[PDB]
Amino acid sequence: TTTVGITLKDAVIMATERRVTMENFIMHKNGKKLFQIDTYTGMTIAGLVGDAQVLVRYMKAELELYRLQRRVNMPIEAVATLLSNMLNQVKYMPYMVQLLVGGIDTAPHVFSIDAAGGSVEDIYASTGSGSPFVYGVLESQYSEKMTVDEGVDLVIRAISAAKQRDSASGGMIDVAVITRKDGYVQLPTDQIESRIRKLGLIL
Amino acid sequence: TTTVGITLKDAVIMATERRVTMENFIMHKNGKKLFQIDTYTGMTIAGLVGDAQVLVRYMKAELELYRLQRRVNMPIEAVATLLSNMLNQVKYMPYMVQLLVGGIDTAPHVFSIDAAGGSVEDIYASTGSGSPFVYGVLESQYSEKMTVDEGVDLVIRAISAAKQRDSASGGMIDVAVITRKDGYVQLPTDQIESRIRKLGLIL
Amino acid sequence: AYDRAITVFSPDGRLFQVEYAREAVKKGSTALGMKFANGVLLISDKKVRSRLIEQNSIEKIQLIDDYVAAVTSGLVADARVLVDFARISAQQEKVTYGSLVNIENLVKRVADQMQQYTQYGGVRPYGVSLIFAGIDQIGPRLFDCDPAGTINEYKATAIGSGKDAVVSFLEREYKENLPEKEAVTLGIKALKSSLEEGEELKAPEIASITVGNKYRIYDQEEVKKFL
Amino acid sequence: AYDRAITVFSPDGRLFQVEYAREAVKKGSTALGMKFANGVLLISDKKVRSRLIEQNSIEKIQLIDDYVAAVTSGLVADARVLVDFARISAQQEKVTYGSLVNIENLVKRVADQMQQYTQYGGVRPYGVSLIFAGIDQIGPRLFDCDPAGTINEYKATAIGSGKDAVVSFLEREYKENLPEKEAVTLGIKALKSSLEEGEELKAPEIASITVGNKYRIYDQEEVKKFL
Amino acid sequence: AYDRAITVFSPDGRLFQVEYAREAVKKGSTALGMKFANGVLLISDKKVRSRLIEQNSIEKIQLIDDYVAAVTSGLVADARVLVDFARISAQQEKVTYGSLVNIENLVKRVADQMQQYTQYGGVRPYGVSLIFAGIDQIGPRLFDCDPAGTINEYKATAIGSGKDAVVSFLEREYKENLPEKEAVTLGIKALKSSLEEGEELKAPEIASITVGNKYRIYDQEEVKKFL
Amino acid sequence: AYDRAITVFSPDGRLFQVEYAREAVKKGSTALGMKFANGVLLISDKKVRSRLIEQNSIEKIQLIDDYVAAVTSGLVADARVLVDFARISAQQEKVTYGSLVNIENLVKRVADQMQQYTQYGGVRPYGVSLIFAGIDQIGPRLFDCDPAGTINEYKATAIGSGKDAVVSFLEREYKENLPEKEAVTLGIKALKSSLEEGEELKAPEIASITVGNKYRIYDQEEVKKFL
Amino acid sequence: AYDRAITVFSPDGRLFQVEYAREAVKKGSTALGMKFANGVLLISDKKVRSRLIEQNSIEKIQLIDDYVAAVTSGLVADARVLVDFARISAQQEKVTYGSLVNIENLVKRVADQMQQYTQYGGVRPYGVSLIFAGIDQIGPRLFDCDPAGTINEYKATAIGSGKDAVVSFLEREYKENLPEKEAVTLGIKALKSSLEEGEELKAPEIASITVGNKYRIYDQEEVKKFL
Amino acid sequence: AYDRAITVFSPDGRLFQVEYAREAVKKGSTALGMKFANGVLLISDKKVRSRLIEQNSIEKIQLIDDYVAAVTSGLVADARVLVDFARISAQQEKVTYGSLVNIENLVKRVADQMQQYTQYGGVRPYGVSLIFAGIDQIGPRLFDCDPAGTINEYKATAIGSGKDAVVSFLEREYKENLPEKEAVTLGIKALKSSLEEGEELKAPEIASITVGNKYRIYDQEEVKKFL
Amino acid sequence: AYDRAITVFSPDGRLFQVEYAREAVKKGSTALGMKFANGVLLISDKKVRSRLIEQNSIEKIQLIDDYVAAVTSGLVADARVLVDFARISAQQEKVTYGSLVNIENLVKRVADQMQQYTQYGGVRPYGVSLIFAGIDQIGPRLFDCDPAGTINEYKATAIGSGKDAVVSFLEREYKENLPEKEAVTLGIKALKSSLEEGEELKAPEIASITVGNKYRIYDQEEVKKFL
């Protein structure tokens, strides 16, 4: 797996790829690892597929319930703190996952959460077996000043590198842009394919 | 074991074979690994025979109960989500299984579910020790445009390959075709045997 | 008096609170079931209450599984909770043995629950009667069940307000092994028997099952042809 | 008064609620059992209620296992629950020791359950009497059991409405060690004795077991030849 | 009398404590719902009590999820506790199957909780009625629910003090499949119908949902254009 | 009044429900025990009720183990449950220490159970008295025990209807250390003393145990020679 | 009558015990809160009882956390136990999510506890009303809560004996968005309004919080300048 | 009235059921204890009831351990259960710390159990008083304990019917630090004081313990020399 | 009437059983505490009852720890059980944090227990008041606590029969920050004030603690110099 999350001025961009392996055997080319879990919040999952999925459902549920009881969306830091507690409570029988939780409250935020419930905010983060290659690309090419279209390209690029050097990663790239104005928008396939072509790339 | 599930325009086709081994010792030539569990849903089982069977019964039960309480059949994605939760709840003392769940709601669907409750939809999937040979055949020979008769042949072919290179697989091939029109129909032996002959094959 | 608590026998050996629970059953609309040639059926009156209520909403015949159905009469909340229990109890039998061999035992498990609430203080009895009809490895079966937990197998029976008019009428006309189409007529006659003075009989529910088959619910167009 | 709660002794030392529970037993139809030459039998009246009730449905003699049977009289729901308890209790003894050596102990386990519900508040007694008859390593055995949890072993006994007419009649005519065919006649006479004024006795149930054999239920054709 | 305890049937078979619990519902302000062309809506009166109370505080239409809403009437504390239960119950269904396929079952789960508190001693019934409205895989749905645990699906219905004036008025004017804008008018007329003698109708709440969409709450500026 | 609940002291400091429980004990038939030269014995009256009851069925002297026996009087169901408890309690002592050293402690364990049901609400006392007789490492022992849980060790004592006649008579005649054959005679005289006006004394039960030996039950042929 | 048990509805659908619990609230001294420009405040009367009581001992405004405060009125023991519950409930929300986003939910959790004691037998309701005031991610918030578990959000409200005098007075004078120093005056006027006939108003407690800041408790020197 | 339930205060703040429990204590025979020179003793009256009761059976002074004894008065069943509880409680203290340092704490543990049964409904108080006498690391100790759970340490005290005669007499004659032989005489004089009109005082029990030694029970030959 | 059960509000919002519990407190002997210069003290009357009771036995001032003491008044059994609870509660705080920082929280924990028994049926309130006095990180502290669970911090207060005479007298004479020797005199005067008509004041108990030091109990020789 390769998932990545970056923050900008008034935006958050999340991307994954879609490959699912049971060892070296590519069982599904087209799984889903990026999920919207609130109006302005998304989550990416890496690690054991079963555990990750159970958590996606709990989160969707518990964040929708929060919203109705409070009439505001759960602050992104609160979402991370909630998960911190859930995962830690069961650290010795854990959910075997790596989560990125990204979104917009008063500002933008990306949080990275481990299987023991340690949560940390950074201005970018990546998770999964392909994550070090993304970190390489981001270290070199990321700027806080980047526009949204510059950022969308950046992640497409990063993941496309990760894909080439991680046999655990592959398939079409999913991207989502989260803004205060238009909310969580999942960029449509044909627009992403268009940019892979324009940057000159493969899968 | 070899089981396979494929989707087409308005159809789902599932096939297994019938061999049951306790190690290298072929104890039964003629077990049953394909089951109808709702009007338009079927399930294939691979893995520990006891666990797989206990699940077949629960599913039959709980999907019949759903239908009466709701007066509609449980959506195929719901069936997969149900199983996801069951298997995950007990991930550390698991059902040692690999399930395919296939059927028709508004469209057709095949889902593959692992022993930790990870569920994923693909347009085809295979499970069991013979699965990689099926995946070889399918990769080469499968088309979305295939007619139902073309598909029925395709799986008979896939499994007949798997049988030849997997000592864990063998016996007569079971096939079922699931359509909105005629529902779950299990194709009768003599019609399958007929097609094995016409494609020029063995067991 | 001795009628204030479910755990108290009267001096003649009566549980008055049970008998009163049974009076709740009489306030329900009539329903009947009868055995016929290789089959069993249920019929139940629909007292329409308003244009504004959805008709395919709470009607009273409920499938327990594909081969077993039930009608209730009495408190509607309690009927619901018992039907849902009956449904779960049927599925448990199917998971333990892969098939419901004798329906008598599904009924017995439901009746047991009902009796249990006539022996412990701090609970009230279920104010419901039920009829259970379906096919099993013995044949077609027709049972009833009351707040007390009391079971009887019948050839024909009724429950609800018009019970007596209907059991009285079948006591005179009922014949074993009619064809389906005639049983249904005989049933409709029985039901009409129970109304007072040239009062309309609007579309009832009818469901039937014959050996080798699954249950079928008559739709109201088919049902009209018997009015 | 002191008759409103199972846990309250009267000043003379009486548990009135238990005594009232016993009145529930009198409302059941009569049944009797008697020991004979290397065997024991049970007979029970069938008050037919309607053409519409299935006859081979709830009749009152129930096998507990292949060598032990019971008749009940009183509240039918409670009879059911006690018979099923008796049946489970027999199987537990068989799993612990591989055989039911003394039937007295099966009865004792059932009677103990019944007594237990006459000592704790918040439960009412079971309104049932039972007769247990069967063969074991001691010989043929005949017992009865009441709401209070009281056991007696008999040569002949009855339960139900006509108990007194029947116990009175056997007190005068009963002989030890008759042959089966005569014991059954003597029983039928006893039963007839209990009806008032030239009233019909319709087909009762009869079940018998003789040492070395299994229980056999007379079918109503065989039973008729004694009427 | 037989009206002091939830577990006690009257001699006619009545649970008076349940019926009194129902009287608590009548003290709430009126609310109604109705189905229309590919949609369903709810309207609820706001009896303003004071300048000093925040208006967007406790108003009575509560989303259960994005596609399901509810109005309550009766004791406000109990309404709250049931709405919060309904909400949790909806999320459980969504975590088990990934979608709420039939709303009838969410209502059934709530109604079951309510009925449970009419069978055990030591608890009182919930003094609340609810209306549930939303879209699901069957279509638009409108339900109600009462202290007894009784469910009905409606085309239009009301709850609260002015229930009868409103159900009476819709019985005469209601038409299936109006457009949204007209349904809302018809609703407001019904509501006005229920007040006595040239009494003001201040801004009610209105919420609607149409197939394929999410719920929308009318803001009071939009609501005024129907007064 | 203060006699309706086991947990309520009267103003004079009386538990009336316990005293009434004691009245149940008086309705049992008389039984007595006495110590003699290196032994102890029990005698109990058999009021024969009918030809039809088996005699070697419920008679009242019960071995608790090979060296300890008990007679009871009062409610028969409760006697049974207490004898079976006593038996289990003896085996527990034997498994913990390999031998019942002091019988006083077996009695104490039974009496404790009995007392426990005179302190908590929601249970009624056991309506039984017992006599315990046997040999242990102290010597021959004779005890009694009542519904209240009260213990006394005796040289001779009685329980049942004719208690007072018998305790009165032994108060005058009893001598320590008689031989077995004379103690038994003295006992029978005591028992005869308690009947009114030239009334028959049919065969009682007698059981005896002497130091170094096991219990022996006199068979009715041997018992007759004392009538 | 129907006012002896919390679980019993009157025939008009009233829980009298709850309404009586509310009468306990009226015996407390008056307290009020009001929203103003970017802030909220609380004021509470101090009826001084004696020179010998420490003043900075039990006064009635309690911080729940740094941004949320409460005043109570009613039974003091129960007030204490609720404030301490509120405090623990706030910290739980902070450990689960790292911040108290909506105060409505803290109040809801407390009100739920209070309602729970108006549905189960064997507990009495809390005899307390509370006001909750603080700032959160929505803005300044003012709530009240009663023995029944009933919530309302206010712009201004009072609790205690002088509630009506004070709510009546604010109904006429209160304006939204005053500055702090004027809101406090208006409050003191309202409070003075509630005393009878030229009676002294000794130093009340005042606490306030404005957006962006923490709570501040006026010390009695600052408070005097408004008398 | 307010005397029917242990949990109910009268309006003057009285637990009448406790007070009545205390009246049970007065029906026991008198017993006294007194401290003397480096020792403490107990004396208790033996009202002989019959030749037929064993004397060395239930007498009232019971060793709790080798250095601690107790007399009881009141219901004998409850006394027993409390003495056995006191014995077990002493051993627990010895296992935890290897020695009973302060007897006050053994008494406190027993008194706590007794008080516990005067605060919860569904249990009645123990109808017993006790005196505890023994030596410990503080010195010789004499305590009493009542149904209420009330402790006092005494130089001399009595319990039972003749309490007041005896406490009155010791109030006038008792001296600290007598020798053993004289304390015993003074005690016997006190006891005699409590009987009416030239009534016999048969052999009481006497037990004594002096610092550095173990308890000793006077045998009735030694006891006679003081009569 | 509404005064028979702790869980029942009167119509004016009163818990009469609590108020009656309070009347138990008035039967205790008087005790008082007061703050002085860098210290706090307690004084309690000793009504001597008999030469025969040990004086250094149950006297009423009990150390909770080395820096905290308490006096009680009311039922002595319940006082004991609360003091022992207070002591355990203090040690828990010390084991969690290594020091008792605020005594208010020890009292709060005890008062919470007391309140808890005024909300659940099936328990009675503790019939006790307490005074708590000691030094902590805030300074010297003086509290009281009643059956209801009500806390107040005082400069001086009293509990017991003569409470009012004493609180009345200190209301007129008490001055802050006296020296120890004068506070003790003022106290003794207050106490004398409460007796009627030239009645003796025998030796009370006095205990005092001053900042930086441990508690000290005046021995009766030192106490005499203030009489």
Side-chain angles (χ1 to χ4, degrees), chain I residues 2 10 34 90 108 112 119 121 139 170 205:
Chain I
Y2 303 86
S10 79
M34 68 181 69
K108 272 195 170 64
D112 273 12
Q119 198 156 28
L170 294 173
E205 319 174 57

PDB file of all heavy atoms in Angstrom, chain I residues 2 10 34 90 108 112 119 121 139 170 205:
ATOM      1  N   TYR I   2     -46.781  10.670  53.566  1.00  0.00           N
ATOM      2  CA  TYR I   2     -45.639  10.547  52.683  1.00  0.00           C
ATOM      3  C   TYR I   2     -44.358  10.377  53.479  1.00  0.00           C
ATOM      4  O   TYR I   2     -43.296  10.791  53.040  1.00  0.00           O
ATOM      5  CB  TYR I   2     -45.546  11.828  51.875  1.00  0.00           C
ATOM      6  CG  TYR I   2     -46.786  12.137  51.099  1.00  0.00           C
ATOM      7  CD1 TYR I   2     -47.828  12.818  51.655  1.00  0.00           C
ATOM      8  CD2 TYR I   2     -46.905  11.744  49.779  1.00  0.00           C
ATOM      9  CE1 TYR I   2     -48.962  13.080  50.913  1.00  0.00           C
ATOM     10  CE2 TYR I   2     -48.028  12.009  49.035  1.00  0.00           C
ATOM     11  CZ  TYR I   2     -49.047  12.661  49.602  1.00  0.00           C
ATOM     12  OH  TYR I   2     -50.149  12.886  48.837  1.00  0.00           O
ATOM     13  N   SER I  10     -42.807  14.276  49.718  1.00  0.00           N
ATOM     14  CA  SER I  10     -44.076  14.876  50.026  1.00  0.00           C
ATOM     15  C   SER I  10     -44.403  15.863  48.918  1.00  0.00           C
ATOM     16  O   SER I  10     -43.541  16.230  48.124  1.00  0.00           O
ATOM     17  CB  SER I  10     -44.033  15.636  51.344  1.00  0.00           C
ATOM     18  OG  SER I  10     -43.418  16.907  51.167  1.00  0.00           O
ATOM     19  N   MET I  34     -14.500  24.513  67.742  1.00  0.00           N
ATOM     20  CA  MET I  34     -14.285  25.870  67.288  1.00  0.00           C
ATOM     21  C   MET I  34     -12.850  26.134  66.853  1.00  0.00           C
ATOM     22  O   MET I  34     -11.898  25.580  67.405  1.00  0.00           O
ATOM     23  CB  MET I  34     -14.700  26.867  68.362  1.00  0.00           C
ATOM     24  CG  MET I  34     -13.813  26.877  69.630  1.00  0.00           C
ATOM     25  SD  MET I  34     -14.370  28.074  70.893  1.00  0.00           S
ATOM     26  CE  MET I  34     -15.907  27.308  71.427  1.00  0.00           C
ATOM     27  N   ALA I  90      -9.620   8.114  54.529  1.00  0.00           N
ATOM     28  CA  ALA I  90      -8.431   8.945  54.705  1.00  0.00           C
ATOM     29  C   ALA I  90      -7.191   8.211  54.212  1.00  0.00           C
ATOM     30  O   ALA I  90      -6.419   8.775  53.417  1.00  0.00           O
ATOM     31  CB  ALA I  90      -8.272   9.380  56.161  1.00  0.00           C
ATOM     32  N   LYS I 108     -16.379  15.274  52.223  1.00  0.00           N
ATOM     33  CA  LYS I 108     -17.210  15.074  51.030  1.00  0.00           C
ATOM     34  C   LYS I 108     -17.426  13.587  50.716  1.00  0.00           C
ATOM     35  O   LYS I 108     -18.535  13.180  50.387  1.00  0.00           O
ATOM     36  CB  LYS I 108     -16.626  15.810  49.803  1.00  0.00           C
ATOM     37  CG  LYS I 108     -17.094  17.289  49.630  1.00  0.00           C
ATOM     38  CD  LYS I 108     -16.757  17.834  48.192  1.00  0.00           C
ATOM     39  CE  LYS I 108     -17.400  19.228  47.853  1.00  0.00           C
ATOM     40  NZ  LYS I 108     -16.920  20.393  48.714  1.00  0.00           N
ATOM     41  N   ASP I 112     -21.082  11.829  50.986  1.00  0.00           N
ATOM     42  CA  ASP I 112     -21.583  11.188  49.792  1.00  0.00           C
ATOM     43  C   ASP I 112     -22.158   9.836  50.097  1.00  0.00           C
ATOM     44  O   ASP I 112     -23.216   9.480  49.570  1.00  0.00           O
ATOM     45  CB  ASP I 112     -20.465  11.006  48.777  1.00  0.00           C
ATOM     46  CG  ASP I 112     -20.277  12.220  47.882  1.00  0.00           C
ATOM     47  OD1 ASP I 112     -20.834  13.335  48.143  1.00  0.00           O
ATOM     48  OD2 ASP I 112     -19.544  12.015  46.893  1.00  0.00           O
ATOM     49  N   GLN I 119     -31.429   7.973  48.900  1.00  0.00           N
ATOM     50  CA  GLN I 119     -31.949   7.976  47.521  1.00  0.00           C
ATOM     51  C   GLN I 119     -32.386   6.626  47.039  1.00  0.00           C
ATOM     52  O   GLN I 119     -33.111   6.543  46.062  1.00  0.00           O
ATOM     53  CB  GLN I 119     -30.911   8.518  46.530  1.00  0.00           C
ATOM     54  CG  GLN I 119     -31.502   8.944  45.200  1.00  0.00           C
ATOM     55  CD  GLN I 119     -30.660   9.973  44.478  1.00  0.00           C
ATOM     56  OE1 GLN I 119     -29.423  10.047  44.641  1.00  0.00           O
ATOM     57  NE2 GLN I 119     -31.321  10.768  43.649  1.00  0.00           N
ATOM     58  N   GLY I 121     -34.252   2.934  47.753  1.00  0.00           N
ATOM     59  CA  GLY I 121     -35.147   2.198  48.604  1.00  0.00           C
ATOM     60  C   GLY I 121     -34.423   0.986  49.122  1.00  0.00           C
ATOM     61  O   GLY I 121     -33.452   0.553  48.514  1.00  0.00           O
ATOM     62  N   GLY I 139      -5.213  25.203  56.035  1.00  0.00           N
ATOM     63  CA  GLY I 139      -5.207  25.788  57.391  1.00  0.00           C
ATOM     64  C   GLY I 139      -6.037  24.951  58.350  1.00  0.00           C
ATOM     65  O   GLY I 139      -6.295  23.776  58.090  1.00  0.00           O
ATOM     66  N   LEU I 170     -22.627  30.885  71.299  1.00  0.00           N
ATOM     67  CA  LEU I 170     -21.407  31.226  70.558  1.00  0.00           C
ATOM     68  C   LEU I 170     -21.713  32.335  69.558  1.00  0.00           C
ATOM     69  O   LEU I 170     -20.842  33.133  69.210  1.00  0.00           O
ATOM     70  CB  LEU I 170     -20.824  30.002  69.846  1.00  0.00           C
ATOM     71  CG  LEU I 170     -20.292  28.880  70.731  1.00  0.00           C
ATOM     72  CD1 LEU I 170     -19.928  27.697  69.865  1.00  0.00           C
ATOM     73  CD2 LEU I 170     -19.116  29.349  71.499  1.00  0.00           C
ATOM     74  N   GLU I 205     -14.561  15.739  77.266  1.00  0.00           N
ATOM     75  CA  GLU I 205     -13.340  15.468  76.527  1.00  0.00           C
ATOM     76  C   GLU I 205     -13.004  16.714  75.777  1.00  0.00           C
ATOM     77  O   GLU I 205     -13.904  17.405  75.281  1.00  0.00           O
ATOM     78  CB  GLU I 205     -13.508  14.406  75.476  1.00  0.00           C
ATOM     79  CG  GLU I 205     -14.323  13.241  75.869  1.00  0.00           C
ATOM     80  CD  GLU I 205     -14.545  12.315  74.695  1.00  0.00           C
ATOM     81  OE1 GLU I 205     -13.510  11.857  74.109  1.00  0.00           O
ATOM     82  OE2 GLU I 205     -15.752  12.072  74.365  1.00  0.00           O
TER      83      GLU I 205
END
